[PDB]
Amino acid sequence: MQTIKCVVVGDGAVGKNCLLISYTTNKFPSEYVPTVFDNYAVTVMIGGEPYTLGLFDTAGQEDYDRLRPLSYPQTDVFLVCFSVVSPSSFENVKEKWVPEITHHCPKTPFLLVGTQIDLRDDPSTIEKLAKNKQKPITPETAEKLARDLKAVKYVECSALTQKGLKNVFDEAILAAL
Amino acid sequence: MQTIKCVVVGDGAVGKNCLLISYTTNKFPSEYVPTVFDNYAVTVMIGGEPYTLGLFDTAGQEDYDRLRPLSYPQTDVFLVCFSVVSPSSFENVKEKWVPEITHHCPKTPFLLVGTQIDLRDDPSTIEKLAKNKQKPITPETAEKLARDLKAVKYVECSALTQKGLKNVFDEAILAALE
Amino acid sequence: PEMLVDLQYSLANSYASTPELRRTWLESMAKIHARNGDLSEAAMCYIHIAALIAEYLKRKGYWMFSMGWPAFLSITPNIKEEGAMPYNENILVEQLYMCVEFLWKSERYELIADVNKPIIAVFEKQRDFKKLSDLYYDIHRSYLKVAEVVNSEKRLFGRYYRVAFYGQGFFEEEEGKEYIYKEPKLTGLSEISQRLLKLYADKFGADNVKIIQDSNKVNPKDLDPKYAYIQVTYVTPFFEEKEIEDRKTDFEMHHNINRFVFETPFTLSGKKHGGVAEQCKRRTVLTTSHLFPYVKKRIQVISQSSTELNPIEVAIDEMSRKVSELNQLCTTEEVDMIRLQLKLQGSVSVKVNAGPMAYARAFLEETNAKKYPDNQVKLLKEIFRQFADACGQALDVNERLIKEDQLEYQEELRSHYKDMLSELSAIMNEQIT
Amino acid sequence: PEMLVDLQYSLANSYASTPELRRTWLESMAKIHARNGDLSEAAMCYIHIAALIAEYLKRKGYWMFSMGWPAFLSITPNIKEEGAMPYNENILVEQLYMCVEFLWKSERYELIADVNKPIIAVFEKQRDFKKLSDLYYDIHRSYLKVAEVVNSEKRLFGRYYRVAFYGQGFFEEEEGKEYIYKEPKLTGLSEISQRLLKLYADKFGADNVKIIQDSNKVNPKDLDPKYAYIQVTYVTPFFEEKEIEDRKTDFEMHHNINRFVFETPFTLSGKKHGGVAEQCKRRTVLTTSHLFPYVKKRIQVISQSSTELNPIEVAIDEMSRKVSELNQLCTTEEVDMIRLQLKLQGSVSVKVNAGPMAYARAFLEETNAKKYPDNQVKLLKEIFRQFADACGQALDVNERLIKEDQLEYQEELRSHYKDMLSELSAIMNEQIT
């Protein structure tokens, strides 16, 4: 087994940690057994070949900005995430994360990963979102940004309804060679 | 799974049939169960590899004169036989046997074989032999003849003591292969 | 649609009837397995056919496999079912060749030898040396494979899932039944749960079927009668300590298993999640009615047990697991840095989760310590000593592997580890290396 | 000099002593065998060592060869010798590898699977899959070879000889003993008798050692006390019809044999040779003390029996033999022309020996028929019929093979055969083909 170092970056209350615990422990978010350690090591099969994808998780608040530079080297691929039902988090991909990671390791590829797609339809979310006068993000405008930001692909997924979950990680590990 | 035609020729009392019977049944001359059939066959190992050497016994009487050479074609090798304690079987080698076989089969190799070499030292034999002014045939004389009549070589043996026995048929097969 | 019910139908058919029907249906089962990619279940079908034929010939007086079905006990103990009843030896043997075709395709290489042994004995008696030579070459080639792949990820036997059905007037023969589903290799909870939902929804209507994601035991009284329910939960094969010794290889870890386990979280506060001082987890071992691999890929759960772990046991467990895992990582002949730095950095530089020193804070400080049972704190102290130990051993191991592209990462790991020592010290009031 | 006494000396040494001397001496016997080319007796030595070690280990409580020596009972029933008396398992196996090396060199390939079978089980227990595959590949190559050469003229296992020694104050251990000597195969009577004479004569002096060529039972009273005597007689392995059924292959004809046979001619007139009406024949079956192959190449004959055949029984026999041999020669796919013509011309056109019609005249004539037992003449009548059959079948076979430089040879064979029919009729008064 050859090991891949993948790294995940983006906001914190967006629920990317949720997506990740969901995929590496095979569990619905409700049933995750919490751990006091970070980073998750998952075994994935692609093109008929098993590899162990190591995931280095980084939370997103500005305080940690200085220590995070240290875990970047030899990363085969990055995963840069937003939430479709959090517009303010869509912007932060343009204004915070993509320029950062691009500035450190320009040539290393990445994805834009839309999360909480189950929520985009729900009436409660979209109405209380319209109170604040914002609409949820369509994969149209997000793939507009994929084809805008030198993004390898825009992929989306739901940790709650289990939709598109496998696809994100397959697309990562394959874009790492 | 191959076979080699060897025809044996010569006079009768020279113990040639006793040579073939004794060798191809691995029995001493006093111990073979007699058979009503002719033509013996023996497997021989040579240069590490088996062969089936087949021995077509011809009778030497002057009656089978017309029918004997029907046994000659397809021959790979000939053994002309004489007894070393029998000088008439020696002259009959020169006068009738080698003339006949080389007339029918000019290209086929043949081997001079002396038999009964144990009697060459048998006192009563040398005494019946000397009384007629005869001596046995010596090795050097048999070999001078094998060279003069262009035999492949002279081999001699003793069916009763087994000395030289194996080598007669090993040199026969060696003659057959080339 | 639904290859799973079709197999159980054919299998249910295989009772109250004749030997030849049992055969006809197992063969049918096998071609469904074959065509659905469940190659181990295709092989267990051919082996059941073999055992059927062997057994039927034995009872008829036709005469190693003259013994009966016991001839095959070493492939699988399920074969004992065929003992409860125009064949001949050449039909038997060919059934054993079908078996071998599918042991090969099912990567269960380690059994080909066992299935070939009776066949070799048939060909000893007929002095058939070319077939002996083929047979021996085959077994040889089979162990060559095992040598290449045993204990590695190149051979993927399956992922198991509890699936339980609940809907009063919806499910028919599976209603209230609980199953283990053996799914093809690396199938995820996401994949298996979505296929079940789409299957049964084509069955009962688009938005009438609900997945139960909770892993607690479903009490049916609490179910909205308007829907059909499918509880889906990842499980791994469960083993006793004796057993864990006795199974060396991954295949032995997947061969003849009837017990499975899954962990459910809960808090004394009645929630599912909570801080480290109140988080517990229940461990549940389901037991099937038949070992895997079997003639079908899903098997009923016939009994179940569970034990519960308090927060201090949750910490004892999870800390022991990382110490061992970090050790195992530093004993290995070829340490791969990426897995090393991942597990090491994931101990000393946590930025998302609470961190190990949370267990140290909750359970080892003197005030919080008196509350819990003594021998548990005393154990947790030693394990945590060993944890700082393994951490230092890993930091030194990893110092050799660095190519100075990420030199300072090793420094920052050091500083974080030393902070962790100072705090662990003031908490335990020991110097801790 | 005298490698045969050396083996027996070492072997006699391996009794009344300890397990380790027994081993040490068998090993020594084996290096003498190896370098003398008796490769099967080197292999039988290593296999006895192996069972020794196994037995000693079992008895010490060290635990397939945990059974004892019976583990090896299928290689040879001699192995039961090891049941009377700092080793370990890896030494046991290494001895078994010595065995396999020498089964290979002795071309007794059919035992390689059996000697390897216990080793496979050792490596099943230690999950050493690569070594399992080597063991299986080896066995595979072993049957590959067997398939290549079995039931053909390639494999030469031995020629056997009775050898008996007689001389009061000459022989010392072998004195009066009678042996079977297993000689490297195709060894002639000429070779073995001359070899024995030169050995023992270097022992006792040039012309003090006499070969006994007679095959009758030696009575010592008739022996010139002035000499040492050595009786040498070709023998072949003897089987009952049941046994001849149970052994299929050439190797099978040379494996685990303790009985040998030889035929002595004699006449009721008390002589050794005579015409077909009074020439008889005795058939003598010697029985060894241990089967071949064994740890030595000569084995004592412990018992003996003989039967005698009438002149007419000598004829019933040799004609049956002749019908069979000619039929067989005419069933073969690619018939060997020279051997065909050899046996045919030697039946229908004999000019040096009496001929089949000698038996026909002596035994089938009406007056001479009255002499012999009736149903025996009836048998010989049928056999003579079948004989004319096979002769005609061969005479037709060969007409196809003729290259047309042998036509007149073929008419003459045919014409002689037709005369032979005429006479056979006038003796039996039947149309005879």
Short mmCIF file of N, CA and C in Angstrom, two decimals, chain D residues 348-398:
data_model
loop_
_atom_site.label_atom_id
_atom_site.label_comp_id
_atom_site.label_asym_id
_atom_site.label_seq_id
_atom_site.Cartn_x
_atom_site.Cartn_y
_atom_site.Cartn_z
N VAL D 348 6.29 -69.58 -38.35
CA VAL D 348 5.80 -70.29 -39.51
C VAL D 348 6.90 -70.89 -40.37
N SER D 349 8.17 -70.57 -40.11
CA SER D 349 9.26 -70.98 -41.00
C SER D 349 10.52 -71.35 -40.22
N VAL D 350 10.39 -72.08 -39.12
CA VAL D 350 11.58 -72.41 -38.35
C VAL D 350 12.38 -73.48 -39.07
N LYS D 351 13.70 -73.27 -39.14
CA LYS D 351 14.61 -74.20 -39.80
C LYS D 351 15.76 -74.65 -38.91
N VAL D 352 15.88 -74.11 -37.69
CA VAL D 352 16.91 -74.51 -36.73
C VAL D 352 16.32 -75.27 -35.54
N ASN D 353 15.03 -75.15 -35.28
CA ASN D 353 14.40 -75.74 -34.10
C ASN D 353 13.23 -76.59 -34.58
N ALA D 354 12.59 -77.28 -33.64
CA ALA D 354 11.63 -78.31 -34.02
C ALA D 354 10.43 -77.73 -34.76
N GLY D 355 9.88 -76.63 -34.26
CA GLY D 355 8.72 -76.02 -34.86
C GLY D 355 7.48 -76.30 -34.04
N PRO D 356 6.48 -75.41 -34.12
CA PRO D 356 5.17 -75.71 -33.52
C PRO D 356 4.65 -77.11 -33.85
N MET D 357 4.78 -77.56 -35.11
CA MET D 357 4.24 -78.87 -35.46
C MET D 357 4.95 -80.00 -34.72
N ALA D 358 6.04 -79.73 -34.01
CA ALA D 358 6.60 -80.76 -33.14
C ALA D 358 5.66 -81.04 -31.97
N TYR D 359 5.15 -79.97 -31.34
CA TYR D 359 4.10 -80.14 -30.35
C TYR D 359 2.85 -80.74 -30.98
N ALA D 360 2.51 -80.30 -32.20
CA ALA D 360 1.29 -80.82 -32.80
C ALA D 360 1.39 -82.32 -33.03
N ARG D 361 2.55 -82.79 -33.48
CA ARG D 361 2.73 -84.21 -33.74
C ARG D 361 2.77 -85.00 -32.43
N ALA D 362 3.53 -84.50 -31.44
CA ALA D 362 3.72 -85.26 -30.21
C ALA D 362 2.44 -85.35 -29.39
N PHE D 363 1.74 -84.23 -29.22
CA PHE D 363 0.63 -84.17 -28.30
C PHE D 363 -0.74 -84.31 -28.95
N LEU D 364 -0.90 -83.97 -30.22
CA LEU D 364 -2.23 -83.91 -30.79
C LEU D 364 -2.58 -85.16 -31.59
N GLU D 365 -1.60 -85.99 -31.94
CA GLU D 365 -1.90 -87.24 -32.64
C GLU D 365 -2.80 -88.16 -31.83
N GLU D 366 -3.59 -88.96 -32.56
CA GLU D 366 -4.68 -89.71 -31.93
C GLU D 366 -4.12 -90.76 -30.98
N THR D 367 -3.10 -91.48 -31.44
CA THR D 367 -2.40 -92.42 -30.57
C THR D 367 -1.72 -91.70 -29.42
N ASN D 368 -0.85 -90.73 -29.74
CA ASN D 368 -0.16 -90.02 -28.67
C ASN D 368 -1.15 -89.27 -27.79
N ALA D 369 -2.29 -88.85 -28.36
CA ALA D 369 -3.32 -88.22 -27.54
C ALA D 369 -3.79 -89.16 -26.46
N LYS D 370 -4.08 -90.42 -26.82
CA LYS D 370 -4.50 -91.38 -25.80
C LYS D 370 -3.54 -91.38 -24.60
N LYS D 371 -2.24 -91.14 -24.84
CA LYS D 371 -1.24 -91.16 -23.76
C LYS D 371 -1.51 -90.13 -22.66
N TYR D 372 -1.82 -88.88 -23.04
CA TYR D 372 -1.81 -87.75 -22.11
C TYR D 372 -3.20 -87.55 -21.50
N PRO D 373 -3.34 -86.71 -20.47
CA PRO D 373 -4.69 -86.44 -19.93
C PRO D 373 -5.56 -85.73 -20.96
N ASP D 374 -6.82 -86.17 -21.07
CA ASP D 374 -7.68 -85.74 -22.18
C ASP D 374 -7.87 -84.22 -22.21
N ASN D 375 -8.47 -83.64 -21.17
CA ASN D 375 -8.79 -82.21 -21.21
C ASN D 375 -7.55 -81.35 -21.42
N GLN D 376 -6.37 -81.88 -21.13
CA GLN D 376 -5.18 -81.11 -21.46
C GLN D 376 -4.95 -81.09 -22.97
N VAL D 377 -5.12 -82.22 -23.65
CA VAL D 377 -5.01 -82.21 -25.10
C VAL D 377 -6.08 -81.30 -25.70
N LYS D 378 -7.29 -81.32 -25.13
CA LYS D 378 -8.35 -80.45 -25.62
C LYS D 378 -7.94 -78.98 -25.53
N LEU D 379 -7.38 -78.60 -24.38
CA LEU D 379 -6.81 -77.27 -24.25
C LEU D 379 -5.81 -76.99 -25.37
N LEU D 380 -4.83 -77.89 -25.56
CA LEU D 380 -3.79 -77.63 -26.56
C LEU D 380 -4.35 -77.60 -27.98
N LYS D 381 -5.44 -78.33 -28.24
CA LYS D 381 -6.10 -78.23 -29.53
C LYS D 381 -6.61 -76.81 -29.76
N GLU D 382 -7.39 -76.29 -28.80
CA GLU D 382 -7.86 -74.91 -28.92
C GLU D 382 -6.72 -73.92 -29.09
N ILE D 383 -5.72 -73.99 -28.21
CA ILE D 383 -4.56 -73.10 -28.28
C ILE D 383 -3.90 -73.17 -29.65
N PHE D 384 -3.77 -74.38 -30.22
CA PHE D 384 -3.17 -74.48 -31.54
C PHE D 384 -4.03 -73.81 -32.61
N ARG D 385 -5.36 -73.89 -32.46
CA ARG D 385 -6.27 -73.14 -33.31
C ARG D 385 -5.98 -71.65 -33.25
N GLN D 386 -6.10 -71.08 -32.05
CA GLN D 386 -5.84 -69.65 -31.87
C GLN D 386 -4.48 -69.26 -32.42
N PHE D 387 -3.53 -70.21 -32.40
CA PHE D 387 -2.17 -69.95 -32.88
C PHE D 387 -2.16 -69.73 -34.39
N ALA D 388 -2.81 -70.63 -35.14
CA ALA D 388 -2.97 -70.41 -36.58
C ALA D 388 -3.66 -69.08 -36.86
N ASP D 389 -4.64 -68.71 -36.01
CA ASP D 389 -5.31 -67.41 -36.13
C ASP D 389 -4.29 -66.28 -36.11
N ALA D 390 -3.60 -66.13 -34.97
CA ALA D 390 -2.63 -65.05 -34.79
C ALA D 390 -1.57 -65.03 -35.90
N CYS D 391 -1.10 -66.21 -36.33
CA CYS D 391 -0.11 -66.28 -37.41
C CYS D 391 -0.63 -65.66 -38.70
N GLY D 392 -1.87 -66.01 -39.09
CA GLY D 392 -2.47 -65.38 -40.26
C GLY D 392 -2.70 -63.89 -40.09
N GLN D 393 -3.13 -63.48 -38.89
CA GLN D 393 -3.33 -62.06 -38.64
C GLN D 393 -2.03 -61.28 -38.83
N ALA D 394 -0.92 -61.84 -38.36
CA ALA D 394 0.37 -61.17 -38.51
C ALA D 394 0.85 -61.20 -39.96
N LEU D 395 0.64 -62.33 -40.64
CA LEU D 395 1.06 -62.44 -42.03
C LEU D 395 0.37 -61.40 -42.90
N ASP D 396 -0.89 -61.05 -42.57
CA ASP D 396 -1.59 -59.97 -43.27
C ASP D 396 -1.08 -58.61 -42.82
N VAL D 397 -0.81 -58.45 -41.51
CA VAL D 397 -0.31 -57.17 -41.02
C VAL D 397 0.92 -56.74 -41.79
N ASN D 398 1.88 -57.65 -41.88
CA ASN D 398 3.18 -57.34 -42.46
C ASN D 398 3.12 -57.05 -43.95
#
